[PDB]
């Protein structure tokens, strides 16, 4: 009924959308992994009479449900998708997208990691993102590579029309006490990568984490704090 939707409010398999700003929504779904249930976010950005999708809904059936939810709520076609790192909460569902006629994109780093680990593989390579601090335009967003953090390949996405910063899994929600799933992380580089984000996007108004509630710029500092403390 209007609040940001949370893990116990979304059965696995169902997707909800949340309006962030004019022409910007997040998508929220839930999935089981290793016997626990987790929420996760992605982004939808209006691109004229089409939509750009950022990240899958964490699984094939969730991603089909995402497409159906977008058709219900928005009614414009998803034409392109970008995955912001190689994990299943970002690429699981790319096969569904690709069979729905969505052109799927990720960095070469993400593509290599996905292939090596047996995750679904976006079709198209995003060049120009291989050095920390790199940025490229993609439709109505800017893609930015901050350096290694949650994963070595993680990208962030900025919506300049709305000052929306989608941090993906390099950014944690304010209620987080722990640094999430750190299996593939670089805890030592993570704070430096967050500081690059802070420097590059000082006018962000909304910050969206990869999992959990959006907020403001404080999510960035909070993330740096929790990662440093976890590493400690
Ligand atoms: C698919 C993905 C994955 C799965 C399960 C949970 C998470 C989480 C995560 C964990 C705790 C959280 N909150 S909590 C402490 O319970 O309160 C929250 C929240 N909100 C989010 C994240 C994240 O932090 O981004 N990602 C996850 N994978 C899997 C894996 C690849 C590797 C195996 N080779 C392990 O690494 C990874 O990230
Ligand atoms: Zn991840
Ligand atoms: Zn994640």
TrEMBL record:
Residues 39-211 form the Metallo-beta-lactamase domain. It is found in: Periplasm. Zn(2+) 3 binds at residues 89, 169, 211. Keywords: Antibiotic resistance, Hydrolase, Metal-binding, Periplasm, Plasmid, Signal, Zinc. The modification Cysteine sulfinic acid (-SO2H) is found at residue 169. Its EC number is 3.5.2.6. Zn(2+) 4 binds at residues 125, 127. Zn(2+) 2 binds at residues 89, 169. Zn(2+) 1 binds at residues 85, 87, 89, 150. Its cofactor is Zn(2+). GO terms for cellular component: periplasmic space. Gene3D superfamilies: Ribonuclease Z/Hydroxyacylglutathione hydrolase-like. One of its GO terms (molecular function) is metal ion binding. It catalyses: a beta-lactam + H2O = a substituted beta-amino acid. Its main location: periplasm. Pfam families: Lactamase_B. GO terms for biological process: antibiotic catabolic process; response to antibiotic. Monomer. Class B beta-lactamase which confers resistance to the beta-lactam antibiotics, including penicillins, cephalosporins and carbapenems. Acts via hydrolysis of the beta-lactam ring. Has penicillin-, cephalosporin- and carbapenem-hydrolyzing activities. Belongs to the metallo-beta-lactamase superfamily. Class-B beta-lactamase family. This is beta-lactamase.
């Amino acid at each position: 009924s209007g609040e940001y939707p949370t893990v116990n409010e979304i059965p696995v398999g169902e997707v909800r959308l949340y309006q962030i700003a004019d022409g910007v929504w997040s998508h929220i779904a839930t999935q089981s992994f290793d016997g626990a249930v987790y929420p996760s976010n992605g982004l939808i950005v209006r691109d004229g009479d089409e939509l750009l999708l950022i990240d899958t809904a964490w699984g094939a059936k969730n991603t089909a449900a995402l497409l159906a939810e977008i058709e219900k709520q928005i009614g414009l076609p998803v034409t392109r998708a970008v995955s912001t790192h190689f994990h299943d909460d970002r690429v699981g569902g790319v096969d569904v997208l690709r069979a729905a006629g969505v052109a799927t994109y990720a960095s070469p780093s993400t593509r290599r990691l996905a292939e090596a680990e047996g995750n679904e593989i976006p079709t198209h390579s995003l060049e120009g993102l291989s050095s920390s601090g790199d940025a490229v335009r993609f439709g109505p967003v800017e893609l930015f590579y901050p350096g290694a953090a949650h994963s070595t390949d993680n990208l962030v996405v900025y919506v300049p029309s709305a000052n929306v910063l989608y941090g993906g899994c390099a950014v944690h929600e304010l209620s987080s006490t722990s640094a999430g799933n750190v299996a593939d992380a670089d805890l030592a580089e993570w704070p430096t990568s967050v500081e690059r984000i802070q420097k590059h996007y000082p006018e962000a108004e909304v910050v969206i984490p990869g999992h959990g509630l959006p907020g403001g710029l404080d999510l960035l500092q909070h993330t740096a704090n929790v990662v440093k403390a976890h590493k400690n």
